[PDB]
Every structure is written in structure tokens, then in C-alpha cells.
Amino acid sequence: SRLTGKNALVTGSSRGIGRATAVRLAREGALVAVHYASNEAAADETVAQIEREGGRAFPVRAELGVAGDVHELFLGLEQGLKERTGETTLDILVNNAAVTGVDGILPEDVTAEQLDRYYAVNAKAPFLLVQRAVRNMPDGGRIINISSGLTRCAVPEQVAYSMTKGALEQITLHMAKHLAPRGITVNSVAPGITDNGGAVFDIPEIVEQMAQSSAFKRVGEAGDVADVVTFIATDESRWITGAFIDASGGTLLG
Amino acid sequence: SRLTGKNALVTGSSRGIGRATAVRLAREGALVAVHYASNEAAADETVAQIEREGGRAFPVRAELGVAGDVHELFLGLEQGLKERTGETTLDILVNNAAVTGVDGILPEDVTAEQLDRYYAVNAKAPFLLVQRAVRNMPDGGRIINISSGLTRCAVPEQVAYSMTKGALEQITLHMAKHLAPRGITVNSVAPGITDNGGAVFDIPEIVEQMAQSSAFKRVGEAGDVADVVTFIATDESRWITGAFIDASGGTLLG
Numbered sequence: 001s002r003l004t005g006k007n008a009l010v011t012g013s014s015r016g017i018g019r020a021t022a023v024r025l026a027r028e029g030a031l032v033a034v035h036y037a038s039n040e041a042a043a044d045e046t047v048a049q050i051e052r053e054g055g056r057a058f059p060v061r062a063e064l065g066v067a068g069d070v071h072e073l074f075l076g077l078e079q080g081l082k083e084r085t086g087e088t089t090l091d092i093l094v095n096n097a098a099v100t101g102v103d104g105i106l107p108e109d110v111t112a113e114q115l116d117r118y119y120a121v122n123a124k125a126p127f128l129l130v131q132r133a134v135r136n137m138p139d140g141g142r143i144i145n146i147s148s149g150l151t152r153c154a155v156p157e158q159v160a161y162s163m164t165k166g167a168l169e170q171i172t173l174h175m176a177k178h179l180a181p182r183g184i185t186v187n188s189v190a191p192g193i194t195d196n197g198g199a200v201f202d203i204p205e206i207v208e209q210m211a212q213s214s215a216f217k218r219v220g221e222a223g224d225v226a227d228v229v230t231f232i233a234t235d236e237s238r239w240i241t242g243a244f245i246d247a248s249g250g251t252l253l254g
Numbered sequence: 255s256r257l258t259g260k261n262a263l264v265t266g267s268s269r270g271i272g273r274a275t276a277v278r279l280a281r282e283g284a285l286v287a288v289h290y291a292s293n294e295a296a297a298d299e300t301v302a303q304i305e306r307e308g309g310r311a312f313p314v315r316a317e318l319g320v321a322g323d324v325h326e327l328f329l330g331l332e333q334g335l336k337e338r339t340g341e342t343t344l345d346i347l348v349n350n351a352a353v354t355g356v357d358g359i360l361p362e363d364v365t366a367e368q369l370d371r372y373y374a375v376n377a378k379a380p381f382l383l384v385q386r387a388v389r390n391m392p393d394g395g396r397i398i399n400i401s402s403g404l405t406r407c408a409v410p411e412q413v414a415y416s417m418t419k420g421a422l423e424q425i426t427l428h429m430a431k432h433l434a435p436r437g438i439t440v441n442s443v444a445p446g447i448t449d450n451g452g453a454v455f456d457i458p459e460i461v462e463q464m465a466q467s468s469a470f471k472r473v474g475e476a477g478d479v480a481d482v483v484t485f486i487a488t489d490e491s492r493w494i495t496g497a498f499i500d501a502s503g504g505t506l507l508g
């Protein structure tokens with residue numbers, strides 16, 4: 001119970017790595033805001049798992065990458081925190097949500113509007129969420145940006161996505177320096193290919209191809225990545241800031 | 255109690271980061287071999303702290319960087335593990351022992367004999383200790399190499415030390431790939447300036463100058479680094495291998 005009395009926001013925790021992260025932060029005692037855009041049933045299933053495991057959580061709906069997104073998210077976050085604690089304190093922000101489909105877009109096919117959509121959700125919104133979140137965050141808080149090993153491994157069909165993760169990792173670098181005087185750490189956690197429940201992971205042949213990228217010759221589980229995020233959220237990571245944390249299963253060995 | 259039933263060797267755990275690491279691994283339930291070169295009293299004090307806290311440990315003497323070093327260390331290690339467990343299994347190796355100066359060596363003054371001594375202790379011995387340790391190591395083991403942020407931050411008067419840490423980090427990269435089929439992870443943890451109990455840390459004016467290197471404007475405590483090492487030793491780090499883990503308090507931010 002390393003996070004008793006703490007409040008956490010995990011963006012995009014209706015499913016996948018964000019669900020696994022929300023579940024683990026709540027097992028540690030955090031009150032978790034389970035954020036989603038569209039899949040309310042999946043958000044409700046994350047919350048229901050947390051409640052059955054003895055924790056506390058509530059859903060927050062906000063489409064990121066559109067006007068009023070940060071405002072909408074913080075309205076629901078602050079109301080839920082205040083009703084459950086009397087306070088609006090935000091100890092932990094995990095920037096996990098993303099436009100992150102498994103379908104490729106090869107460079108010849110990328111459109112200006114896809115560049116805009118990826119960047120709005122994956123780079124701009126995390127920056128503006130950090131800016132708003134720190135108002136509420138005590139000295140000693142945690143900001144965790146979920147990147148990708150693709151910032152270190154060329155994959156042409158993910159160029160547009162990868163650009164936005166490169167921008168996200170700059171948030172880590174420069175905001176770690178900015179926020180250090182407050183004792184707020186800022187780190188990137190980089191997954192590799194990770195089973196998020198999507199249909200591709202139900203095709204054993206494709207999963208075995210995907211698995212070859214890892215030194216361990218398996219795809220990641222959501223919990224493999226979420227276990228690393230959870231450690232970073234704890235006190236014992238205090239001496240790690242501005243860092244790139246490889247949570248890829250040995251996919252970044254060159 | 256994340257390391258119940260596991261056996262750990264922390265090289266150079268009579269003092270400093272290694273002592274703090276041995277103490278924390280033992281708090282998690284590991285049986286810790288507390289290795290030292292010549293300060294038996296300091297080793298016996300690490301062991302006595304672990305025993306007062308309810309854990310198990312024993313001292314192992316072996317000078318590294320001399321003929322017969324690995325053999326001598328593993329004689330003492332295996333005897334102590336066999337006496338206490340009936341087995342010689344080694345779950346965790348932390349390559350922490352190293353040679354250094356109080357204030358480095360200007361490049362013009364580095365001698366061949368100094369290059370050899372730094373190499374022998376800080377790079378060669380860790381490789382040969384990994385080579386021997388895996389004979390004993392079950393699937394799912396941990397090898398943790400303690401490096402330095404100086405592999406990323408130019409400091410001329412540390413060129414000789416830093417060469418050896420550059421070599422050590424290559425053990426991490428290449429042995430992570432080699433050992434991945436066994437589920438043994440191999441990672442580097444890189445401290446910045448860290449209070450090891452040396453007399454310089456009793457001089458407040460010098461500590462305040464050293465402190466400016468961290469983004470947090472304090473020197474690291476041994477436990478700041480040891481807490482990161484301890485997490486790497488646990489099951490929840492399973493998806494981290496071949497990594498450079500910054501445990502410097504934001505020293506590479508500048």
C-alpha cells in the first residue's frame with residue numbers, strides 16, 4: 001500500500017495499458033480517476049474491477065485533442081476528487097491516452113489531418129494536461145508520460161505516431177528540469193508491442209511475428225508495462241527524473 | 255517481502271551504496287552475501303544491521319582485480335549459501351564494488367598502471383563475475399551493474415574512471431540479449447554524486463557545491479540509489495532489460 005491517501009489520474013484507462021495501470025495504482029491505495037473518451041462501458045469495467053478489489057475509482061469522460069478538452073477533464077476530475085476527499089489534490093498524472101491504432105500508415109499515405117490528430121492528442125494535450133495538473137500537485141508529485149520504443153526503432157508505417165512520441169519525450173526532458181525545484185518528477189516509460197486486448201492479439205500467427213521484436217520472444221502484457229509505471233509513481237523512484245525508462249521487454253537492444 | 259527465498263550477492267556492500275543496497279534487499283527477504291575487499295569491520299556492520307532488522311546475511315571477503323578473485327569470492331559465497339539454505343543458487347548479482355579517487359586524475363597524469371587498476375576492478379571483474387554467477391542462476395534472475403552518470407557527462411578529470419563505466423555498460427547491453435532466453439535481466443543503474451559516508455560528505459561547503467549537480471540541488475543519499483536497485487531486483491521489473499536507468503537525481507538535465 002505505497003500510495004495510501006494519494007490521488008491519481010490515468011488518461012485512457014478504459015482499456016489496455018491504462019486499465020492495467022489504474023488497477024495497480026488502486027491496489028496500492030490511490031484514488032484513481034479513470035479517464036476515457038468514448039468507451040464508457042470499458043471505463044465502467046476498469047472502475048468495477050478496482051471497486052471489487054477493494055479500491056476507489058471513478059470515471060471521467062473527456063475527448064482530448066479538441067477545444068475545451070483539458071477544462072472538461074479537470075471539471076470531472078475535481079468534482080470526483082472533492083466529493084470523495086474534500087480536496088482536489090492530484091499526486092500522480094499518467095499521460096497514457098493516445099491515438100495509437102495498430103494499423104500502419106506508410107509515409108506516402110499520411111495526411112495533414114492525421115498529423116494534426118496524432119499531435120493534438122499525443123503531444124499537445126499531454127503538454128497542456130501537465131500545465132493544468134501541476135496547479136493541483138503537491139511537492140513530491142509524479143508525472144509519467146507513456147511513450148513508445150518506436151522513438152528508438154525505425155518503423156516507417158508508424159512515422160506519424162512516432163513524431164508525436166518524440167515530442168512527448170521532450171515534455172519529459174524540459175519539464176523534469178522545470179519542476180525539479182518542487183520535487184515533482186517527470187519521466188517517460190516506453191512500451192514495446194503490448195497486448196491491449198485488440199483483435200490483432202487474437203491471431204496467434206501475427207502475435208508470433210510481433211513477439212520476435214522482444215529479446216524474450218513474447219509480446220508484452222499490459223501488466224508488464226503497468227508494473228513499471230506503478231513503481232515510478234511510488235516514493236522509491238524519487239531519484240529518477242527526466243529519464244527514459246525502457247519497458248519494452250528487451251526490444252531496444254538494436 | 256518481494257525477495258523471500260532469494261539469494262543475492264552485492265559486491266562492495268561493506269560501505270556506501272552497496273551497504274544501503276544489501277540492507278534493502280534483506281528487508282525484502284533476500285539472503286544477502288555482503289562482499290568486501292578488506293574492511294571486515296564495515297562488512298560485519300552491514301551484516302549486523304541486516305540481522306537487527308530481522309533478515310539474513312553473511313560476509314564474503316575477496317579482493318577484485320587480482321588473480322584468483324572470482325574463485326575466492328565464489329568459494330565464500332557458495333559456502334555461506336550452502337550452510338544457510340543447502341543450495342548454492344544465486345538469484346541476484348549486483349556489480350557495485352569499484353575503484354575511484356576522492357577528486358579524479360587529470361588526463362595528462364593518468365598512468366598505464368592506473369588504467370589497468372581501474373579496468374581490472376571496474377570492468378573486467380564485473381564481466382567475469384557475471385560469467386561465473388550465471389552457473390548458479392535460475393531462470394528469472396537479475397544482474398544489476400552500477401555505472402555512473404559520467405558516461406553521459408564530460409568531466410576530463412574522470413576520463414579513466416569513466417572509460418571503465420563505459421565498458422561496464424556494454425556488459426549490460428550484450429549480456430541482456432545473451433541471457434534473455436533464460437529470463438535473466440541485465441540492467442545498468444547510474445548514480446550521480448552520492449553520499450557514501452566518505453569524509454568529504456562531512457564538509458558542508460563542499461557538499462553544497464556537489465549538490466548543484468543534481469536538478470534537486472542536494473547530493474544523493476545511498477538509499478536513493480539503493481531503492482532503485484532494489485526495485486530492479488524484484489519481479490515487477492521483468493520487462494526492463496538491457497536498460498540504462500538514471501538514478502542521478504536529474505544530473506543529466508544540466
Ligand SMILES: NC(=O)c1ccc[n+]([C@@H]2O[C@H](COP(=O)([O-])OP(=O)(O)OC[C@H]3O[C@@H](n4cnc5c(N)ncnc54)[C@H](OP(=O)(O)O)[C@@H]3O)[C@@H](O)[C@H]2O)c1
Pocket residue numbers: 011012013014015016017018035036037038039040042062063064065095096097098099100101121146147148149190191192193194195196
Ligand atoms: N500497446 C502497444 O503495443 C503500445 C506500444 C507502445 C506504446 N504504447 C502506448 O501506450 C499507451 C497505451 O496504449 P494502449 O495500447 O493500451 O492503448 P489502447 O488500448 O488503444 O487504449 C487507448 C486509450 O486511450 C484513450 N483515448 C484514445 N484516443 C483518445 C482521445 N482522443 N481522447 C481521450 N482518450 C483517448 C482510449 O479511450 P476509449 O476507450 O474511450 O477509446 C483508451 O482508454 C499509449 O500512449 C500508446 O501509444 C502502446
Ligand SMILES: NC(=O)c1ccc[n+]([C@@H]2O[C@H](COP(=O)([O-])OP(=O)(O)OC[C@H]3O[C@@H](n4cnc5c(N)ncnc54)[C@H](OP(=O)(O)O)[C@@H]3O)[C@@H](O)[C@H]2O)c1
Pocket residue numbers: 265266267268269270271272289290291292293294296316317318319349350351352353354375400401402403444445446447448449450
Ligand atoms: N558515490 C558516488 O558519488 C558514486 C557516483 C557514481 C557512481 N558510483 C558507483 O556506485 C558504486 C558504489 O559506490 P560507493 O561510492 O558506494 O563506493 P565506496 O563507498 O567507495 O565503497 C566501495 C565498496 O567497494 C569495495 N571495493 C572497492 N574496491 C574493491 C576491490 N578491488 N575489490 C573488492 N571490493 C572492492 C569496498 O570494499 P572495502 O570496504 O573492503 O574497502 C566497498 O565495499 C560504484 O560502482 C561507484 O563507481 C558512486
Ligand SMILES: COc1cccc2c1C(=O)c1ccc3c(c1C2=O)C(=O)C[C@](C)(O)C3
Pocket residue numbers: 100101102103148149150153155158161191192193194213248251
Ligand atoms: C521493432 O518494432 C518495435 C520496436 C519498439 C516498439 C515498437 C515496435 C513495433 O514494431 C511496433 C509496431 C506497431 C505499434 C507499436 C510498435 C512498438 O511499440 C506501438 O508503438 C503501438 C502502435 C503504434 O499502436 C503499433
Ligand SMILES: COc1cccc2c1C(=O)c1ccc3c(c1C2=O)C(=O)C[C@](C)(O)C3
Pocket residue numbers: 354355402403404407409412415445446447467502505506
Ligand atoms: C557533471 O557531473 C556529473 C554528472 C553525472 C554524474 C557525476 C557527475 C560528477 O560531477 C561526479 C563527480 C565525481 C564523481 C562522480 C560523479 C558523478 O557520478 C562519480 O561517478 C564517482 C566518482 C568518480 O568517484 C566521483
